[PDB]
């Protein structure tokens, strides 16, 4: 007969509460654990993998062609190839990647994003591409030289067929990655004058996510 008074908060079912429950089958052991490869421990492990962005999500595009940035020989220098924002939670190109899907299950995120471009053109066809990152709050650059001043990477197809651009930091106006025709898409005779670039994004060791939430894709 120990004294005990029912403090308020009893007689209630708290959904979030981490409290134990009486087992249905006490003393019943489960199947012993075996070694299954590919064990996960956090969603960050799923966030740090490169995944294709749907940068060509514009209209009049079929299924597979929506993942491809079309580059052509008949495009002048100092011209814009493609542009997309950096924030993955908001709808757009990042609605297709995995980090832009996992971050929709949370409310807040903060870390450095990695963007990769991989070129699918003839080995005999080369060119140059300016990949410029516009920090948040700055409008989309209208000219190639304005985009050149900020963070950028000069990408040469002849030497590197896949370039990386680490974005310093983003949070929950967003930050724009633009693709600029630096010189041209030169092409030898008897070779298609139209190639494609695929954009793939991921996260880094700085990425953290706070406060879960239910998605709206369903």
């Amino acid at each position: 007969g120990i004294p005990a008074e029912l403090r308020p908060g009893t007689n209630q079912f708290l959904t979030t509460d981490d409290d134990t429950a009486a087992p249905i089958l006490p003393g019943f052991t489960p199947t012993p654990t075996i070694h299954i490869p590919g064990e996960v421990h956090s969603l960050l492990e799923l966030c740090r993998v490169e995944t294709i962005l749907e940068v060509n999500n514009t209209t009049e595009a079929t299924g597979l062609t929506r993942l491809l940035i079309p580059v052509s020989s008949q495009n002048k220098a100092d011209e814009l190839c493609a542009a997309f924002m950096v924030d993955p939670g908001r709808i757009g190109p990042w609605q297709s990647t995995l980090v832009g899907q996992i971050c929709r299950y949370y409310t807040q995120w903060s870390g450095s994003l990695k963007v990769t471009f991989m070129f699918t053109g003839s080995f005999m066809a080369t060119g140059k591409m300016l990949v410029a990152y516009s920090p948040p709050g700055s409008a989309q650059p209208a000219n190639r030289e304005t985009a050149m001043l900020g963070t950028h990477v000069i990408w040469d197809f002849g030497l590197q067929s896949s370039v990386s651009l680490v974005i310093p930091w983003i949070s929950n106006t967003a930050g724009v990655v633009t693709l600029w025709y630096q010189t041209n898409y030169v092409v030898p005779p008897e070779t298609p004058g139209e190639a494609y670039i695929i954009a793939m994004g991921a996260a880094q060791d700085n990425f953290t996510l706070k406060i879960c939430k239910d998605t709206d894709e369903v």
């Binding site: 995944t51 299924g63 993942l67 297709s96 070129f119 699918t120 080995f123 494609y196």
Partner: protein, 207 residues
């Protein structure tokens, strides 16, 4: 180079472990990548179910467990452009497409010939292809490399399972970048797959 260890795990030993010619290299028929191609998939236990010693073992043994050394090569010229994603998908459940159809054995277990993708965008499973890079994957760029090596260990919730009624994983190759060429070039280029079943174990020798 192009070496990839799926999940950083090696096919391994725990049955009868032949490992004389069951571990040899089986090379499937080459697939002709065309400009309107949509991709192909192979359910691996089903792939080797009639290839000599492995076929005999798999069909006449109840239980089976092994890893795999995979080599996907696309023989293209320097005037051809295109990209190919080579991913291994554990329990690749091919789904139906009824707006309730129940596929068919020609699709679910396509054999050593393989089957094509009807809707490569949804992976014929309702999942978008963009996120398919979560699996152990390899890019094949006709401008950079031709060989794509993936070493996949045994991925199963049970140490052994039948090699005739269950598919351990599926191997998919998809032309994310359509094949493009000029006039007079080879209109269809081949893709070659070689299979090396490392650390094979078999049990339950049925007739």
């Amino acid at each position: 180079a192009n070496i990839v260890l799926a999940y950083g795990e090696w096919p391994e030993y725990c049955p009868t472990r032949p490992d004389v010619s069951v571990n040899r290299f089986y090379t499937l028929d080459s697939k002709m990548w065309q400009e309107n191609s949509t991709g192909w998939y192979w359910k691996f236990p089903d792939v080797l179910n009639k290839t000599g010693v492995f076929g005999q073992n798999a069909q006449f043994h109840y239980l089976y467990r092994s890893g795999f050394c995979l080599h996907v090569q696309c023989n293209a010229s320097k005037f051809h452009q295109g990209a190919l994603l080579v991913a291994v998908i554990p329990e690749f459940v091919i789904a139906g497409r009824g707006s309730a159809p129940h596929p068919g054995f020609t699709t679910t277990f396509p054999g050593t010939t393989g089957a094509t993708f009807h809707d490569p965008y949804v992976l014929d499973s309702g999942v978008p292809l963009s996120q398919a890079l979560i699996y152990p994957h390899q890019w094949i760029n006709l401008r950079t490399n031709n060989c794509a090596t993936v070493i996949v260990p045994y991925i199963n919730a049970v140490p052994f399972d039948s090699a005739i009624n269950h598919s351990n994983f599926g191997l998919i190759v998809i032309p994310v970048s359509p094949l493009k060429y000029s006039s007079g070039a080879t209109t269809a280029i081949p893709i070659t797959i070689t299979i090396a079943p490392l650390n094979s174990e078999f049990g339950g020798l049925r007739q």
